[PDB]
Amino acid sequence: ILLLRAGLPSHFHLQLSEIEFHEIIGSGSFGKVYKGRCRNKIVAIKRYRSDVDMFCREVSILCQLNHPCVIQFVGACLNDPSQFAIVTQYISGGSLFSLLHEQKRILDLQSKLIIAVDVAKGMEYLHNLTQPIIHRDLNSHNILLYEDGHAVVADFGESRFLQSNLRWMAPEVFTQCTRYTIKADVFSYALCLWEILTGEIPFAHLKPAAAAADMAYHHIRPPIGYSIPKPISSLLIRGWNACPEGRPEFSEVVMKLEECLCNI
Amino acid sequence: LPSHFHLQLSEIEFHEIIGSGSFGKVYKGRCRNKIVAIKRYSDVDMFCREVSILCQLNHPCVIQFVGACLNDPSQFAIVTQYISGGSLFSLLHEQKRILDLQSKLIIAVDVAKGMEYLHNLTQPIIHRDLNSHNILLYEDGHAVVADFGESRFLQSGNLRWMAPEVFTQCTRYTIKADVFSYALCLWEILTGEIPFAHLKPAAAAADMAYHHIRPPIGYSIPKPISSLLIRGWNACPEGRPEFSEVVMKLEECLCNI
Ligand SMILES: CNS(=O)(=O)c1ccc(N2CCOCC2)c(Nc2ncnc3[nH]cc(Br)c23)c1
Ligand SMILES: CNS(=O)(=O)c1ccc(N2CCOCC2)c(Nc2ncnc3[nH]cc(Br)c23)c1
Numbered sequence: 040i041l042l043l044r045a046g047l048p049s050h051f052h053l054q055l056s057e058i059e060f061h062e063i064i065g066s067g068s069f070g071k072v073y074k075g076r077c078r079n080k081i082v083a084i085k086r087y088r089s090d091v092d093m094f095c096r097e098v099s100i101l102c103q104l105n106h107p108c109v110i111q112f113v114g115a116c117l118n119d120p121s122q123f124a125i126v127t128q129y130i131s132g133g134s135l136f137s138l139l140h141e142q143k144r145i146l147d148l149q150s151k152l153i154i155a156v157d158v159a160k161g162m163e164y165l166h167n168l169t170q171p172i173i174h175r176d177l178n179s180h181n182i183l184l185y186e187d188g189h190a191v192v193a194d195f196g197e198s199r200f201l202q203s204n205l206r207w208m209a210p211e212v213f214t215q216c217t218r219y220t221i222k223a224d225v226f227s228y229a230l231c232l233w234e235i236l237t238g239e240i241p242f243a244h245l246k247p248a249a250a251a252a253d254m255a256y257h258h259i260r261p262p263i264g265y266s267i268p269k270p271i272s273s274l275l276i277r278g279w280n281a282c283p284e285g286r287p288e289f290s291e292v293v294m295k296l297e298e299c300l301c302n303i
Numbered sequence: 304l305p306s307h308f309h310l311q312l313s314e315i316e317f318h319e320i321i322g323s324g325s326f327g328k329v330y331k332g333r334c335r336n337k338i339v340a341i342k343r344y345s346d347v348d349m350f351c352r353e354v355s356i357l358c359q360l361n362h363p364c365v366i367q368f369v370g371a372c373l374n375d376p377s378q379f380a381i382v383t384q385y386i387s388g389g390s391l392f393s394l395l396h397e398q399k400r401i402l403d404l405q406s407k408l409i410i411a412v413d414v415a416k417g418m419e420y421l422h423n424l425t426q427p428i429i430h431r432d433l434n435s436h437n438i439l440l441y442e443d444g445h446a447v448v449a450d451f452g453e454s455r456f457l458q459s460g461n462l463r464w465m466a467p468e469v470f471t472q473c474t475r476y477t478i479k480a481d482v483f484s485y486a487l488c489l490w491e492i493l494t495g496e497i498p499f500a501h502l503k504p505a506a507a508a509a510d511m512a513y514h515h516i517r518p519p520i521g522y523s524i525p526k527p528i529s530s531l532l533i534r535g536w537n538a539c540p541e542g543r544p545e546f547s548e549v550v551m552k553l554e555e556c557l558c559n560i
Contacts, residue, residue, distance in 0.1 A: 204432065205507070207484045211540060213512050214468045219468050223465075224466075226467070227464045241463065241464070242463070247460050252539075254467055257539060280513075281467060281513045
């Protein structure tokens with residue numbers, strides 16, 4: 040916290056008294072997320088309820104980020120653990136999850152791709168920083184939408200910087216010993232991309248742990264209909280390959296989806 | 304650790320080296336009037352773990368602990384019974400001895416009983432590193448499980464979009480990992496072949512985990528056993544048998560050998 044207070048540029052340093060908390064817009068064990076106001080901006084605030092090290096990491100990551108497909112950091116409060124809070128821009132159009140599954144708004148192909156492309160661009164950005172960042176929690180809740188249908192990647196509370204005998208191991212043990220890479224994000228993305236196209240929650244009929252289990256152990260993936268365009272189904276098939284190294288880099292995901300926009 | 308298990312370096316008479324690795328070296332020797340094997344080695348946490356496991360062990364199909372030296376990090380040493388008949392891996396792959404089906408099953412059942420034992424202790428133990436190097440043979444062709452350096456005591460909505468490799472890492476190890484390992488050992492035993500002989504170990508571990516590859520089952524393997532094998536190396540841990548059931552079926556086979 041002393042190391043952080045020193046390294047984080049001072050313009051980001053916020054006092055809790057500078058923040059006005061309106062509503063709660065999201066929740067969790069970690070803490071709650073309020074809509075509010077700060078330095079004459081409409082903002083979203085994550086407030087916290089090893090906890091120190093989690094918060095110091097998250098700020099260290101957020102303050103690196105500048106890209107129009109990634110949530111815009113505004114500042115944090117670093118006084119003491121009790122005060123701890125994180126502030127970002129607010130985006131009115133709400134989560135992608137809501138759009139698809141609650142409001143059940145029916146989007147056309149162009150609109151869907153724009154979103155897919157924007158998210159891929161944000162991930163590309165993160166993965167190709169000098170010191171790559173893994174989001175590690177990409178989902179339709181953490182894809183937020185501008186009124187005009189563009190999208191940004193949010194919530195870096197699980198994010199980590201990428202760091203710099205097996206013949207008889209059970210697969211799940213072998214997988215524990217292998218440190219995960221930026222490729223984990225691509226797998227999450229793939230599901231998001233299917234979620235967008237179908238309108239459907241992955242394994243909608245299953246509780247989260249069961250769905251994970253099926254993907255992980257029984258190697259199941261959501262159904263790929265014949266009507267899904269080829270270049271996309273390809274990306275899906277590759278993107279959620281159990282073998283991480285077989286998943287495409289986001290730079291290619293972008294390239295392909297932008298092609299589709301040219302042909303849309 | 305129980306005071307009687309404490310050992311001083313002077314109580315241990317070293318002889319030749321019998322094994323190696325980045326971890327350290329293993330010696331044959333003599334201690335407290337018995338022929339022994341001696342192992343010699345964040346890094347301290349893992350030693351107490353290994354020792355706290357070994358002292359608990361008391362079963363004919365599991366290695367016998369004898370004691371351990373605790374003076375300082377430089378002096379750390381673990382001492383066990385020495386077993387004259389070498390490693391199974393050797394017998395199978397270097398010596399290449401031809402065994403009857405009975406001899407094979409005797410080893411298979413012995414290893415299974417040792418694993419059963421471990422798994423059904425009040426506070427169960429996962430070996431986490433079973434293989435034909437750590438299966439040691441008595442001259443009479445009985446076998447024991449060895450080398451507990453990797454062994455662990457069993458510990459008591461984002462998940463839906465997680466990559467498998469990440470989900471696996473947020474999940475706690477189970478005893479069913481040993482069952483998978485055993486399956487391979489069992490196939491190895493029956494066929495005499497190293498699993499995926501044509502591949503280097505990581506290539507093998509990848510193919511088993513990602514591309515769901517398993518060893519080939521030919522008429523070389525009997526039907527009742529081959530059912531066990533397939534279930535044993537299931538991708539789903541929960542689909543794999545418990546070692547109790549392995550024992551039953553394999554003893555049932557021994558009745559018919
Ligand atoms: C402090 N910002 S943050 O990036 O750490 C952050 C984390 C989580 C969330 N929620 C996302 C939806 O599931 C619940 C958590 C948000 N939410 C939002 N951030 C901006 N504009 C927003 N508009 C609507 C919403 Br909800 C919204 C921010
Ligand atoms: C201190 N005993 S221990 O259980 O920690 C232990 C760990 C590893 C090994 N080696 C096994 C073979 O690959 C290399 C490591 C052994 N070795 C042996 N222990 C008993 N009798 C033995 N006879 C022949 C051999 Br080798 C042998 C013990």
